[PDB]
Subunit: 70 residues, 7 copies
Amino acid sequence: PFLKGLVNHRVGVKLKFNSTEYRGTLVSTDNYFNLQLNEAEEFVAGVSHGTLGEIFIRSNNVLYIRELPN
Amino acid sequence: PFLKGLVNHRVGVKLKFNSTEYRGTLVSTDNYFNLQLNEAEEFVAGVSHGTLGEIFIRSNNVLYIRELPN
Amino acid sequence: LKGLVNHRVGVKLKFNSTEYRGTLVSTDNYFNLQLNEAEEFVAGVSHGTLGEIFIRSNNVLYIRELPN
Amino acid sequence: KPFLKGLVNHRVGVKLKFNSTEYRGTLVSTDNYFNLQLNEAEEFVAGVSHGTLGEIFIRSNNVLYIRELPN
Amino acid sequence: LKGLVNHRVGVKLKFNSTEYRGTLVSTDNYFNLQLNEAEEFVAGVSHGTLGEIFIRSNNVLYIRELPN
Amino acid sequence: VNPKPFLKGLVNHRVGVKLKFNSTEYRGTLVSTDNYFNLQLNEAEEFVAGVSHGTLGEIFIRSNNVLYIRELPN
Amino acid sequence: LKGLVNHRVGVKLKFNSTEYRGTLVSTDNYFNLQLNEAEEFVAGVSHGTLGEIFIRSNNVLYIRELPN
């Protein structure tokens, strides 16, 4: 259970392009890396550009995912 | 599935190359992320650029999908 | 997607404000599609009539139903 | 199950994503993959002939679309 | 590849001379890997420490083992 | 019993493998292949603008980068 | 591809005109390869020695055996 380990945890989704990162609670996923983020907050350069709701992010745009410091 | 949850909801599909977002009622979908929108309205930088009928969007172009709130 | 066959549609190419309009003869899950009486549209101006075309998904952004 | 099959032995135009290049020829064979064989191939750039290539085998990816060339 | 599990490796992305270093926790044929105590390196300068990161193959150029 | 190599005929023939980017062509003998368009070229000569840029031995090419393959001469 | 295992090969990337030279330890049917004693060559010049590297298929242009 590689990716499932992060469910119900607060993570940072970083994209390949720009320095953009979505931070939120990782609702659901799938091997495909397609993921579901709740209470997602958009971060640019480490600055908040708002809160998006529940977003479904597609794998292809993802560089990597991290667990947000408790 | 993953996106079956949003069916019949008003959602925003955000593309990966421009500040464009298509808004509408997600009629149907599939794992491949390929979605059909109803009452689609194109949004550029947050500005309506008019209305397309029923559109079918190809996953590949999709950055993420959120649920529209009002 | 089959809900549009023999309907007048527009196939929007991702890369440049180019959209092919015609009737959607046939398709398949793959988003590869066959268009009839294709008309290529640049920034919404016609650039002539292509015959029947068989287009490749990958180049497609979206497909919409052309009116009335 | 074959897709385009209906153009085999037809005079068609294979247009590429980048460069207004068009490879015109007859189609030997094609498979669901859109990878296709072309006979008596003539490269076209902007509507101009830039020569003739033998028989070519094209890779789907670089293909925007295919059309039937007017009899 | 599983030869590197519990190994200090370095992940080099395709774009931009950015390498992620840390211990290779787990992986799979898909090249999608987990990295523990990752440290972002840019042009071979530490840009910080990411906690545990899960990387997507497609961004990866190559992986190497960090020297003893 | 259902699928086979659609490029079978060119094996051991003098071909030209053209890439998507540049105007680089790799000419050689088509050693082997596979539906995947992944091919083994023997006596591979790098061509740029129809100009030789030396010779590469046996090369193993990847389909992705390949625009099209053609048959070189009699 | 297996015909190169334990051979000295040079791997060519699509983007920089820079090649990875080394012993081809392993490879699977995905074009991903493990290279031992990798040396990185830029426009024909050596820019250093990487240890063991596992290279991802997508980045590769082509593979050749070496006149050593």
